[PDB]
Amino acid sequence: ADQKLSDFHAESGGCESCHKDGTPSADGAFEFAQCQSCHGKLSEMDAVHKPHDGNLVCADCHAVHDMNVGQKPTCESCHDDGRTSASVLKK
């Protein structure tokens, strides 16, 4: 049993949880503002998240309409050094 991350959110909050009047914005800014309003800012999150504050929006990693709940983003589309989440979060 699988659910897209967008549907997981919309089942509780509507499409409007992320989209003004349920309609996407051209630049993703309204959506990013909504993610941060609920979840906090990148700068307030863990070591995978913090360094992306000022360079990415959430959706650059969490493709909410194409990823299921539980799926973890990986790093290779922007980093060519083979890094992993664990290499930043495990000591």
Binding-site residues for Zn(2+)? 80
Q: What three-state secondary structure class fits 48?
A: coil
- Residue 28 near residue 61 (C-beta atoms within 8 A): no
- Residue 19 near residue 13 (C-beta atoms within 8 A): no
Q: Note whether 15 binds ligand HEC by CB under 6 A.
A: yes
Q: Note whether 4 binds ligand HEC by CB under 6 A.
A: no
DSSP 5-37: HHHHHHHHH-GGGTSGGG---SSSHHHHHHHHH
| Binding residue ranges | 9, 15, 18-19, 35, 38-39, 49, 52, 58, 61-62, 64-65, 70, 72, 75, 78-80, 83
Given the rule CB under 6 A, which residues bind ligand HEC?
A: 5-6, 9-10, 13, 15, 17-19, 22, 24, 28, 31, 34-36, 38-39, 42, 46, 48-49, 51-52, 55-56, 58-65, 69-70, 72-75, 77-79, 83, 85, 88-89
